[PDB]
Point group: D2
């Protein structure tokens, strides 16, 4: 099947200023995300080579390379369209109602998501996801790209808390980055994903 | 929405002998899985309490408790019907063809899955999953319940490599447990999940 | 440098009964610890080969194999002499006084240590250690063998909470294993370790 | 016991230019290291409170906060004096001879160390350490601050590969940061640490 590819940004590289700089968007998308695409394709290619030669002695390496890079690729693929120069404000419609039901209010959702974002020790993400078993909205606090999450959980809104996502602009003051993020959230994009996710069940 | 519950086993507790003992099935399902159900419901209840009282200072604890227990619950929910007293043999139909295409052959799939299973350092799982971004079959080697995996990946076939899943019968000789597992795989169940998973895309 | 070797047990397999079975002690020492010794020697051999042949692209694998196996070897090397058929009771002398100072009382230390032991999510350890920077006693809750700890911290008392350490005897009821453990702690060994540790500083 | 404190830098912020910028050194030491000092003291205070008030159900959180922050404090405490404006060149004397014996040559040590540094998937460190069991030099590739290492191993030379350590200057090009690092290694400091380490045994 077709290899992974780097998706293009769906807005100008400087479209998210003054909240996320064009300097960051260029490095983050063009360099960091590109590396995951290559790493994910390479992990699959190397696993196919291992199977074909009958030597799976490096399986642990290949499986971590696969998880790390595929997770990085999935996470950034969702992240870019989650942002918009026409973003901000609050979720509406069925997504807004579901957030009120799952978290109490938009304010409480935001406070929980923000606390999950700033609490990470090392690299990671705060995400809103749909649990396909319970058929419900949850927040997950990812470690690196591929840890601290349940299988099947379907990503809806991502916030990258790796230092490369904010350091050039905000230095160590990551809370100011988290606050800025709310200005650029593309709730229409999150709503489309929610429509897709709600059709998925574990079985 | 409705709380998580413990699913019943879909066969007799001793149905998988001599491959997995009834002694293990009873403890593993009735005690271990029950604990994840309670832990997952409790994590959500405690997160709701934290939001309502405006104190998210324990978010890191609650988010790991959620990930660990929800992942445990998802993983075992898929695991039980993945096994059957009428299991064994090989995948057929579109699932069999997809495994041949993704892994080269059933033998190569089995060798890769087995190597992933025995290579774990600590607790974990070998799983066959559908990557919802690439629309393709992959193996993932999970750490504990909730690590070393990509968001969205949809579980199809699980092998629990926590020591509680095999120690009473096989002691330290986990390779013999992995070999025994192939005798009880419910390929019809895996095929149904694959039919469900193939309808899911990241977007 | 000389290869790592498996230390002998300082007592007969059954010497810790009824608290820890001879059945477990034999498997645990003769099979599990032996595998970490081999794994640690193999990791060093493979690192030397990778340096010599130019294969340091495998470094992440080889360094995880080294950490996991060397940590397992270290941890079990401390564990066996930490137990004794003539143990139990309480720490005395300077060790007893330091535990009182650091934790409040022996009973409070036991409550904290026991909570760290039973709380592990996955495989791990509860340990008492000397922090060589702060020159003070701490508990550390290790993940697997090699996670959740500070460099230099010097192990004094170990409790193995991997399921292989207790499952055959206590099944899922790890609190009963932890309760049993206190009857076999070799406080004289812990005290010797403490004397050695207090001479170590980070500098 | 006395609370942890932030050690002063042994040189001016800009003393490592052009290899590591004063801009980074100031943020890194004055903001990031300060936070680990506070976090480590806070973790110990919160553990004492949990013991006293009966709240050890929070033990997993408090022990992760302790490990993460104490490890960060340890690691940076070693890092600053490991660097010098009068460094670079090569290890000599007994340290140089031991590196030749353990790694083949200084050049082979540098290749291994550099591969461990650039290979990290997430935040972490490459370190040279003394294994207090085997009485030998090893490299360890730390995850975050507190992962992928063996208890007791005594740190000699640290390279911080968290993105905050290099991003403002080197952006995503971490190989150029690692190349730069060799020009500022304080081999006299590493040699002192090695003298101290060789007197430590696991026992
Ligand atoms: Fe990123
Ligand atoms: Fe299980
Ligand atoms: Fe063990
Ligand atoms: Fe740092």
């Amino acid at each position: 099947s077709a290899p992974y590819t780097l998706p293009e940004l769906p807005y100008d590289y400087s479209a998210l200023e003054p909240w996320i700089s064009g300097e960051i968007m260029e490095l983050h998308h063009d360099k960091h995300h590109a590396a995951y695409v290559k790493g994910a394709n390479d992990a699959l290619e190397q696993l196919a080579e291992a199977r074909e030669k009958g030597d799976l002695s490096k399986v642990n390496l290949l499986q971590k390379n696969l998880a790390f890079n595929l997770a990085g690729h999935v996470n950034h693929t969702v992240f870019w369209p989650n942002l918009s120069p026409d973003g901000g404000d609050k979720p509406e419609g069925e997504l807004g109602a579901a957030i009120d039901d799952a978290f109490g209010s938009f304010d409480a959702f935001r406070a929980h998501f923000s606390a999950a974002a700033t609490g990470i020790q090392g690299s990671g993400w705060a995400i809103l996801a749909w649990d396909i078993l319970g058929q419900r909205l949850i927040i997950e606090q990812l470690y690196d790209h591929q840890g601290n999450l349940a299988a099947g959980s379907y990503p809806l809104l991502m916030l990258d808390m790796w230092e490369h996502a904010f350091y050039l602009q905000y230095k160590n003051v990551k809370a100011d980055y988290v606050k800025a993020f709310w200005n650029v959230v593309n709730w229409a994009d999150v709503a489309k994903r929610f429509e897709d996710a709600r059709k998925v069940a574990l079985g």
